[PDB]
Amino acid sequence: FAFKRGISTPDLALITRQLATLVQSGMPLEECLRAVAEQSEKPRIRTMLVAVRAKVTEGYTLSDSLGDYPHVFDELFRSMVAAGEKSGHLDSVLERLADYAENRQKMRSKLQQAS
Amino acid sequence: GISTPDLALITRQLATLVQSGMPLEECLRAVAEQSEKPRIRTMLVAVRAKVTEGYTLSDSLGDYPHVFDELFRSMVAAGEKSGHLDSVLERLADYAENRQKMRSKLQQASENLYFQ
Numbered sequence: 197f198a199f200k201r202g203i204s205t206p207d208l209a210l211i212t213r214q215l216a217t218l219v220q221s222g223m224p225l226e227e228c229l230r231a232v233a234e235q236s237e238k239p240r241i242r243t244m245l246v247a248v249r250a251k252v253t254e255g256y257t258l259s260d261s262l263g264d265y266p267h268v269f270d271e272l273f274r275s276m277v278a279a280g281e282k283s284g285h286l287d288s289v290l291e292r293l294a295d296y297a298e299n300r301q302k303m304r305s306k307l308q309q310a311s
Numbered sequence: 312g313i314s315t316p317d318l319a320l321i322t323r324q325l326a327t328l329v330q331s332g333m334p335l336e337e338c339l340r341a342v343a344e345q346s347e348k349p350r351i352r353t354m355l356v357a358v359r360a361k362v363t364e365g366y367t368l369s370d371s372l373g374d375y376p377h378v379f380d381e382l383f384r385s386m387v388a389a390g391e392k393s394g395h396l397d398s399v400l401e402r403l404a405d406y407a408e409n410r411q412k413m414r415s416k417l418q419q420a421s422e423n424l425y426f427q
């Protein structure tokens with residue numbers, strides 16, 4: 197039996213926002229992933245993003261690469277990325293995913309605060 | 312001015328882009344293009360225009376002292392002068408993120424307890 201957990205809601209919000217911002221600026225996907233990793237304060241997240249990037253540099257899509265961490269990026273997240281990649285809208289779906297992740301962080305906090 | 316979350320957003324985005332090695336004017340263009348808030352887009356385009364004309368970022372931000380306070384602009388100035396804008400922006404992003412997180416949690420906790 198194996199078992200791994202995802203990352204915190206703020207941690208997902210930060211990296212999704214950074215990746216969306218970098219991709220939308222017109223930088224190569226691999227270079228965007230390098231920057232998000234290198235700017236991370238979270239060793240596990242840094243390692244994960246180095247591994248996602250490693251797959252991207254072998255030529256795989258972002259969605260397929262995120263596939264190596266299904267415990268972190270769920271099927272829906274990876275489906276949204278794939279939809280963007282297939283339709284030529286990776287930039288605007290990453291924006292959507294960033295907005296989603298930030299809203300998720302906020303609502304999780306709203307639920308739990310003062311408990 | 313603008314909200315605590317919106318300052319955190321643009322500061323994180325600008326820090327992220329600058330630390331990637333992208334020229335400052337190009338970074339400012341991207342943050343502008345990506346903004347949902349028309350007022351913020353306007354401000355960033357105006358700041359970008361000034362930077363391309365040779366004004367420093369710190370001097371340009373002084374046109375919006377209601378958004379970028381004396382500490383913020385002072386920090387940027389120190390970074391530009393020293394050739395370390397990249398790391399100063401990172402610290403401003405961390406600071407702004409932290410402020411948003413801690414203030415948002417107080418807001419939510421206050422809402423939750425006060426209205427229960």
Ligand SMILES: [Ca+2]
Pocket residue numbers: 291295347
């Ligand atoms: Ca948005």
Ligand SMILES: [Ca+2]
Pocket residue numbers: 235237401405
């Ligand atoms: Ca940091």
Ligand SMILES: [Cl-]
Pocket residue numbers: 200244
């Ligand atoms: Cl893991």
Ligand code: NA
Pocket residue numbers: 271275
């Ligand atoms: Na799917």
